[PDB]
From Swiss-Prot, chain A:
Subunit of the fusion protein that is processed upon entry into the host cell. Mediates fusion of the virion and cellular membranes by functioning as a class I viral fusion protein. Contains a viral fusion peptide that is unmasked after S2 cleavage. This cleavage can occur at the cell membrane by host TMPRSS2 or during endocytosis by host CSTL. In either case, this triggers an extensive and irreversible conformational change that leads to fusion of the viral envelope with the cellular cytoplasmic membrane, releasing viral genomic RNA into the host cell cytoplasm. It comes from Severe acute respiratory syndrome coronavirus 2. This is Spike protein S2'.
Swiss-Prot record, chain B:
The chain holds residues 346 to 394 of 1273 of the full protein. It comes from the Viruses. Attaches the virion to the cell membrane by interacting with host receptor, initiating the infection. The major receptor is host ACE2. When S2/S2' has been cleaved, binding to the receptor triggers direct fusion at the cell membrane. When S2/S2' has not been cleaved, binding to the receptor results in internalization of the virus by endocytosis using host TFRC and GRM2 and leading to fusion of the virion membrane with the host endosomal membrane. Alternatively, may use NRP1/NRP2 and integrin as entry receptors. Changing R1T: In strain: Omicron/BQ.1.1, Omicron/XBB.1.5, Omicron/EG.5.1. This is Spike protein S1. Changing R1K: In strain: Mu/B.1.621. It comes from Severe acute respiratory syndrome coronavirus 2. Binds to host ACE2. RBD also interacts with the N-linked glycan on 'Asn-90' of ACE2. Cleavage of S generates a polybasic C-terminal sequence on S1 that binds to host Neuropilin-1 (NRP1) and Neuropilin-2 (NRP2) receptors. Interacts with host integrin alpha-5/beta-1 (ITGA5:ITGB1) and with ACE2 in complex with integrin alpha-5/beta-1 (ITGA5:ITGB1). May interact via cytoplasmic c-terminus with M protein. May interact (via N-terminus) with host bilirubin and biliverdin, thereby preventing antibody binding to the SARS-CoV-2 spike NTD via an allosteric mechanism.
Length: 49, 49
């Protein structure tokens, strides 16, 4: 931001924000699968208990 | 003593306080577009070399 003016900074910013979203969406997607895996184990423990 | 294209003149800049607004009185500046730095945002940056 301190190096580029707004007219073409947003072009560079747009690549960064879309890159981190793909990093962020990957994180939650793997979290959801892991949470399902744990919940299956937690249900198994509850049934076991 | 501006040199030829096949052997251009290379000058290094050492420690100083370079104001990138008082050089406007040196040329009509036919082409002044920059690549990775906003030309307006030049007095707020510290440069390596």
């Amino acid at each position: 931001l301190s190096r580029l003016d707004p007219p073409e900074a947003e072009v560079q910013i747009d690549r960064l924000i879309t890159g981190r979203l793909q990093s962020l969406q990957t994180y939650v997607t793997q979290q959801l699968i892991r949470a399902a895996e744990i919940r299956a184990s937690a249900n198994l423990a509850a049934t076991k208990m | 003593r501006f040199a030829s294209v096949y052997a251009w003149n290379r000058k290094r800049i050492s420690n100083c306080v370079a104001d990138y607004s008082v050089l406007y009185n040196f040329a009509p500046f036919f082409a002044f577009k920059c690549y990775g730095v906003s030309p307006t945002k030049l007095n707020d940056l510290c440069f390596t070399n």
